[PDB]
């Protein structure tokens with residue numbers, strides 16, 4: 001089959017990213033895999049005449065024993081964007097977010113059957129390091145479509161549409177969305193009818209040589225995380241003070257959170273412990289206040305042109321809160337994540353959020369992670385399971401944990 | 406020879422073209438030399454005669470060798486090295502002795518005339534053209550080009566080690582029980598075989614290399630471990646660093662202090678307890694390299710301990726893949742941490758030290774955490790796996806800190822080891838306001854154009870103090886106003902501030918800072934028995950805050 005010519009964003013050059021050191025077991029795993037992918041002609045050893053590099057890691061399947069290879073094309077994707085986004089983009093169905101059930105299938109192997117424009121293969125160079133640098137390092141490059149690369153779906157878009165054609169024609173009320181390595185299939189059918197429909201789809205796929213998982217999302221059961229206000233029996237000065245502080249915050253966001261009435265309440269210079277009475281306009285202010293805070297900020301709309309940002313706060317006790325927004329304090333969605341290691345949970349939450357993000361908006365957000373850069377980089381892969389990797393910057397959470405958002 | 410190996414295709418940077426530098430007039434003695442030389446190379450295949458159809462020329466020189474015995478052919482490649490494509494890197498890290506398996510037999514074979522025994526890409530030779538001038542530029546001169554790897558060219562090291570790999574690949578495969586490490590010209594071959602079965606294997610390799618154009622020693626193998634490599638002295642049994650020797654001068658120049666600090670840092674990989682905080686403190690502040698810096702008592706004592714440590718030779722052992730890895734971390738001075746990594750009680754594999762600060766305001770629980778993250782990373786690289794730690798911290802102290810900190814923290818398998826000092830949080834911050842405890846509504850202001858602020862406070866018991874401040878930021882008047890509420894205040898106290906900034910710094914339980922103030926506030930905090938901090942929107946007019954805010958901003962604001 002003829003190949004598609006690919007060009008980088010003119011002005012930008014190929015990826016030159018360092019390879020984060022790996023542990024023994026992951027190096028052994030990687031050499032086995034790459035050894036086989038070579039015999040099969042998917043990748044080819046390369047010389048030093050290739051100045052490019054992209055990091056690679058070894059992760060686990062859906063909790064199985066098999067080690068899977070995971071190249072990190074974050075960079076390359078960026079130098080390619082124009083291509084995989086404008087030239088040959090892939091429409092994102094607004095119906096997916098509404099579905100009662102959405103199943104995700106890893107149609108990754110699918111790309112290994114399509115050759116990559118020879119003039120582009122040098123930009124997919126990666127290195128399998130060695131321990132204690134006792135070796136130069138094993139280099140390779142891709143001959144076929146690689147799995148991390150967002151370019152792979154775009155190209156394969158043609159072949160994907162045919163394969164799915166029959167199924168779609170016969171099942172018009174099922175949304176099929178494709179996003180970098182995965183297939184999102186949603187429907188409003190009863191679970192079993194859905195689950196069945198999914199099997200049927202594997203069969204079509206199977207005929208064009210394509211395995212399958214499993215893994216069900218229920219979008220329509222995704223709701224907001226209101227900004228919680230207390231509702232205590234007693235009352236101290238301190239409590240009402242915090243009550244005012246938070247309310248004050250929720251004013252630059254959520255227009256109409258009148259706090260004036262509740263403020264000026266029991267003032268002067270009292271002890272913090274001193275318990276206090278109640279008010280009538282107060283009871284009513286809280287009422288309307290929360291009433292507003294319960295529902296999304298009026299005036300905030302998703303702008304396709306701008307980046308999505310996800311911020312996470314460690315609430316303690318295994319609780320994690322997050323907000324996705326494009327303009328600070330203009331939450332498009334907020335949420336929570338609950339339920340062993342601090343890093344493990346965080347990585348878990350990052351994947352969950354990224355997933356919801358892909359379904360609702362068709363793009364991954366950039367994370368502001370509440371952790372030490374070094375620690376994250378040293379351990380994330382240890383629990384990571386998705387086939388994609390979002391952009392992330394390590395932030396330093398302000399005492400903003402107070403207001404859950 | 407010239408290796409029969411295939412060639413690595415190379416090219417100039419995209420829009421650029423070959424080099425065309427003008428050959429500067431050289432003298433007769435120099436002109437004669439280069440001819441006697443090039444003729445010799447040409448006779449071996451290293452270079453070839455070409456004509457003036459090649460628009461590319463590269464400047465040639467010649468300088469005399471030791472005491473002026475023979476000349477040398479220097480080829481200023483700068484211009485070409487600038488138009489040549491980029492390559493991968495020859496080495497991304499350097500093996501650490503501690504990561505070497507213990508070996509019985511080890512010999513070091515060094516390849517002779519490396520770059521000259523490897524073919525250059527035919528389509529690239531045309532760029533490696535240079536010319537030998539005629540006395541006072543009359544005759545056109547002799548033009549030559551390269552058939553092998555030029556000495557000072559950008560791609561020689563890359564293409565060489567690259568080539569050397571392929572050549573070795575077969576031999577390695579047939580001898581899976583033989584480790585070969587390539588570092589430039591030299592080749593390190595070690596095994597568990599006997600000097601007999603070993604030197605036999607060596608030849609087999611020398612031969613293998615010869616079948617590829619690689620001439621290697623015979624009796625000048627240099628194998629003779631000991632081994633001085635990259636600043637280390639290796640023995641088949643153990644390893645250690647090249648011998649250190651401390652100057653012992655009467656005066657120290659910034660230069661002297663530096664060499665010294667460099668030797669010690671290098672010595673700290675295996676000599677536990679090395680300390681250079683007091684000495685490094687002396688290099689602070691722009692200072693000439695020849696300026697004499699007087700040693701302060703502390704540094705004077707520090708240089709002492711180090712001398713003490715370096716006297717009796719200390720050695721490191723090698724890595725046993727079977728046994729586990731254990732790392733212990735001790736807290737030396739303030740902010741300083743030393744650690745040792747071993748597999749068998751006290752037979753250190755390697756030693757180290759962490760002393761980084763990491764921003765102003767921080768505590769031992771946080772510093773200890775970072776040191777673990779370092780040692781973890783370091784351990785991965787060298788040995789491919791993370792060690793179990795032994796930390797001078799209570800399972801409690803840790804467990805209580807991690808759960809009450811906003812940042813996410815992890816920490817590999819560890820155990821508490823009672824090796825004093827012990828890490829502890831020097832104070833907590835009550836979560837509930839203290840009942841029947843004087844509440845201090847602190848605040849501060851500061852005229853931005855003047856710098857005149859009044860940091861004060863007002864309590865629920867009437868008291869109200871207000872001090873004036875000069876040359877201060879709006880932040881200091883908020884951090885100072887807290888210092889006040891802490892001074893003339895009892896053992897228990899509730900403090901209400903409108904300074905997120907201050908709230909932030911303090912809520913993180915720092916036990917050391919770079920702010921002269923912050924340290925003071927810390928002293929107080931360690932003295933109190935119950936402190937409660939809270940926040941409220943600054944100058945929003947709230948019960949209490951307003952009251953203070955008033956007399957704080959009353960003029961001079």
Ligand SMILES: COc1ccc(C(C)=O)c(O)c1[C@H]1C[C@H]1NC(=S)Nc1ccc(C#N)cn1
Pocket residue numbers: 132133134500505506507508511584585586593594595630631632634639640641642723
């Ligand atoms: C990673 O590979 C290197 C890096 C450096 C050296 C050096 C400096 O000799 C080296 O021999 C090697 C590899 C041959 C193998 N050596 C191994 S594993 N162990 C030992 C043990 C003692 C000595 C002794 N004496 C040298 N090597």
